[PDB]
Enzyme design. Sequence first.
Site, PDB file in Angstrom:
ATOM      1  N   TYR A 175       9.194 -24.417   9.534  1.00  0.00           N
ATOM      2  CA  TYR A 175       8.508 -25.548   8.933  1.00  0.00           C
ATOM      3  C   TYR A 175       9.396 -26.774   9.095  1.00  0.00           C
ATOM      4  CZ  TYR A 175       6.512 -28.867   5.688  1.00  0.00           C
ATOM      5  OH  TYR A 175       5.986 -30.006   5.178  1.00  0.00           O
ATOM      6  N   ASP A 189      17.506 -28.409  11.479  1.00  0.00           N
ATOM      7  CA  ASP A 189      16.796 -28.991  10.373  1.00  0.00           C
ATOM      8  C   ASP A 189      17.364 -28.382   9.080  1.00  0.00           C
ATOM      9  OD1 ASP A 189      15.072 -29.667   8.356  1.00  0.00           O
ATOM     10  OD2 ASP A 189      13.248 -29.304   9.492  1.00  0.00           O
ATOM     11  N   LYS A 231      15.921 -32.790   1.139  1.00  0.00           N
ATOM     12  CA  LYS A 231      15.509 -32.410  -0.222  1.00  0.00           C
ATOM     13  C   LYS A 231      16.520 -32.553  -1.374  1.00  0.00           C
ATOM     14  CE  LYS A 231      11.706 -29.310   0.478  1.00  0.00           C
ATOM     15  NZ  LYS A 231      11.316 -29.185   1.903  1.00  0.00           N
ATOM     16  N   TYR A 246      -1.248 -30.245  -0.326  1.00  0.00           N
ATOM     17  CA  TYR A 246      -2.205 -29.315   0.290  1.00  0.00           C
ATOM     18  C   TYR A 246      -3.323 -28.903  -0.678  1.00  0.00           C
ATOM     19  CZ  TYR A 246       0.652 -28.849   4.515  1.00  0.00           C
ATOM     20  OH  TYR A 246       1.332 -29.089   5.691  1.00  0.00           O
TER      21      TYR A 246
END
Lengths: 426, 428
Positions: free
Chosen positions: A150, A247, A276, A18
Site C-alpha cells: 500500500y 516507503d 504517519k 473509504y
Amino acid sequence: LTPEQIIAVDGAHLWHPYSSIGREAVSPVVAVAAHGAWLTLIRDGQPIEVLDAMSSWWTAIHGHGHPALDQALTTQLRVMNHVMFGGLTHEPAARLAKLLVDITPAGLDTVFFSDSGSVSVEVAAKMALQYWRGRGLPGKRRLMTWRGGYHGDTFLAMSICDPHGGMHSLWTDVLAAQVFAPQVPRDYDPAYSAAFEAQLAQHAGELAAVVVEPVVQGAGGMRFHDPRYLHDLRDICRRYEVLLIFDEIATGFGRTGALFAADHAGVSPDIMCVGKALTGGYLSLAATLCTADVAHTISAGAAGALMHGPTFMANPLACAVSVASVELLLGQDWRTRITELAAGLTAGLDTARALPAVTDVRVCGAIGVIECDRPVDLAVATPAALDRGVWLRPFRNLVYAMPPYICTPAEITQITSAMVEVARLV
Amino acid sequence: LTPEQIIAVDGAHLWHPYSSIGREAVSPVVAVAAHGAWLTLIRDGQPIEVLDAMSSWWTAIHGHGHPALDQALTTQLRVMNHVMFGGLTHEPAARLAKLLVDITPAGLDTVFFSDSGSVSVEVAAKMALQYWRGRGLPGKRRLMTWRGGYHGDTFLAMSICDPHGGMHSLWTDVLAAQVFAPQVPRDYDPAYSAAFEAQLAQHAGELAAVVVEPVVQGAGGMRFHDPRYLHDLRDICRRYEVLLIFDEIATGFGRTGALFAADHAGVSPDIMCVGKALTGGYLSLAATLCTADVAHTISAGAAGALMHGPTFMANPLACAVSVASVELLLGQDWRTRITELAAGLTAGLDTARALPAVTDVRVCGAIGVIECDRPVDLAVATPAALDRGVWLRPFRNLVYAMPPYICTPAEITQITSAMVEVARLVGS
Ligand SMILES: *Cc1c(COP(=O)(O)O)cnc(C)c1O
Ligand SMILES: *Cc1c(COP(=O)(O)O)cnc(C)c1O
Ligand SMILES: CC(=O)Nc1ccc2c(c1)C=CC2=O
C-alpha cells in the site's frame, strides 16, 4: 455541537475514509477527547475512556497530548505559524531536515517536505523519473513492486498498491500499468529473490524504480517479511541500474523495533518516504529523502529543478512539533521500550494461536496481528472491544494493534485481551 | 540555530519549491517571526520588518498570529490533538463541514477532507470517475479544461495544468492525455464559448468532467476572465451531461471580491475544491465538496464507497483553526473590506501603466498584478522590494500581490509603491 448534533451533521455531510454517504452500516462514534494512550468516546450518550490500540492509524507514537509536544507546538505558535518556503527558510525546517538526515539510513542527504504520505510517494516517483531523464534515459519511467503493498490514494500511488487491496478492477483503465512481482513471503527463500531479479531484468530498460514497504506491509494486510529480501532488492537494483525506494510511512520512527525498518537489513534506499508518525500524530506532514547523486543528477538535468512545491511545504508548526517528537524518541531508550511492547504483545496474544478461527498470530516490534480464517464482522467486533475499554478497528480477516509507545504492561495486557476476545467471537 | 547556521543546513539538506539542490541562483532568506501582516526576515545579519504582500502564498488572509486563530488552536490542543477518522467523528469536523456546506455554492452538501490542494483535486477527479462508473458509463474517464490553468503537482493534477505555460510541460509523455480548450480570454466573447461547446461535443462520451479555476487563474499566470464564461460552462455541462468541477483552492474565502469566485456568476459546480486560505494559513488542509446526487450515485455503485482515505483526514487541530478562520471572515463585513483593498490596489498600481516595461495592470478583489514585457529577475526584484519594506515574490513576467485582508490603507499603498519600483527596475 452536542454528540447527537455531531452525528446528524456527520451522517448528512461528512465523508469518512473509504466510506459512503447515506449507506454506512456504522455509524461512527463521537470522539470528544484524547489524552496519552486513551480516547474519550461517546457510547449510549456517555463519555467512556478507551485505549487507542491503533495509535489513531499509526500516528500517536508518544500518545495524544504529550506535554513536550503540546509545548513545542504552542511555543512555535507564538513566534511564527507559517511562511511560504518559496524564497524563505526557517529554523523548524532546518532543525528537522538535519535530524532526519542524521537518523535515516546512510546516504540520504536531502529532504523534500510535503503534507501527506501519498504526496511524498508521488514526489519520490517524480524524483526517480527526473533522475533518469537527467541521465538521458527517459524510457526508464515504469515502477516495480511486489504484491500486498500500500502506497497511498492519489492516482500514481494507487498504481503500485496491491491490485486487489486497491481494487484495480474498478480502475481499468485510468491507472499506470506497473510491474508486479508475486507476494513476498514471510520466511526467507532465495528463489523468490532470484525470480524477482529475472522479472526485473527483462523490464530494466523501462524501469525507473523498485518501490516497496520494508519488513512490514501495513494497509495491504499487515504482512511481515524477512529483512534479507531488502538486501537482495538493494543488490538487484544496484546491478541492474534501477532506483530503490523504501516507503517508510508506516514503518518509520521505531515502530518495527528498529529506528527505520530498513535498519533491520542494514541497507540504504536511494529514495525514502516518511509520514504517519513524523509529527507524533499531531499534524499532517511527510518527507521524501534522496541521496546526493539523485539530488545532483536531477539538478544538473535538462529541467534543472524538481518540479514540485506544495503550498504548505515545510510548515513551521508541523516541523516544530515533529522536531520535538523525534528528539523525544531519541532522548529515551526507545529500543528497550519497543522490545518490551513486542514481548507484551507476544505474551498477550499467545492464547489466540489455539482458537479455532485463527490461522496466524504474529508480532514485529510494537505491532501485533491475529489473522483469522474469515472476515471479522465489525458490528460484533467493535462494541466488544469497547466493553473491554479498547478501540480496535479490524479490517478483513485481521485483528491487530499498533499501540502508542507509552502503553504500560497493564495497558498492553488490556489491549491483547480485547483482541483475543474479538478472535473468540469470530 | 543562528541565521547563518540555518543557511548552511538549508543549502546542504533542504529542497525548496521548484528548485535545485546546490544550483540555487539566490540563497533563501531566513524568516524568524511573523505577526499580523509583517514578517521578520534576516538581511545582512539584521532583523527587518516587511509586509507579507504574498499572504505566504495566498494563505494568510487574516495575517499571522491572529488572537482568534492562535486561541482556537490552543483550545483544541488541550482537548484532542487528533483521532483517526475511520469509525470516529468529532466536533471540529462536524462544525467545519456544517459551515462549508452553508457558505459554498448551493447544492454542495458533502465534504471530503484531505491534507493538500493537489490531493483534494485527485479526490475531485476520483469522485467524477466513480460517479460515472456508478451510472454504468465507465468510458467517461477523461477531463477537459482550458489553457492557462494550475491544479497541483501530483500526477493526475499535473495532467490538467497548462501543457506549455506551464511548469509540468516536460511530463506530457507520462501524464494522462486530457482535453484542452484554448486560453479563456479576459473579455466576454460568445464565440469562445461556442467553440468550447463544439470541442466538448466530440468528447462528451469520454469526458467525466470539466475542471477549471473560476474567474482567476492563479499559478498559471494571474489571468482574469469574465464570469459569464462560468455560466456558459454550467449550461454546456448540464446539456452534455459532463460534471463541472471548480478548483477554488486559490480563489476561495473572499479573495476575488466574492466569497467564492463561482458566486460572481451565481454558478454551482457539481464538485468544488478549497485549500490555501481554508485554515487562515496556519496548517495544511483542503476539502473537496460534491452534490448529494454525486455522493449517492458513488455510494450505490460497485465500490459502495469513495475509494480514498488520507491518514490525517479531518485532523481536529486543522479543522478547529479553519472553523475559527471562516467564522472570523463571516463575522465581519468582509465584502466592504475586500472592496477597499481592491480600490487601494487599483489606485496604488495605476502609475505602473505608464512604465516602459509594463504591458498590463489588473486588479480583482485582493489581487493586484503588474504584467511586464520580460521575465522578472528575482535577484533584482527581491532585494528591491525588501529595501522598501515589502516581501514580494515575482514569477515569470509578473509582479503581483495577494495581501492579507487585515492590511491598512497605508500598508496597501506601501505594497503597491514597492511593486511600482520593482516594475521600474525591470525597465532599467
Ligand atoms: C498511509 C500510508 C501512505 C499514504 O499516506 P497518507 O498520509 O494517508 O496519504 C503511503 N504509504 C504507506 C506505506 C502508508 O502506510
Ligand atoms: C496551490 C493550488 C493547488 C495545489 O495546492 P497544494 O496544497 O499546493 O497541493 C491546486 N489548485 C489550485 C487552483 C491552486 O492554486
Ligand atoms: C478503510 C481503508 O482501506 N483504509 C483506512 C482505514 C482507516 C483510516 C484510513 C484508511 C486513514 C485514516 C483512517 O482512520
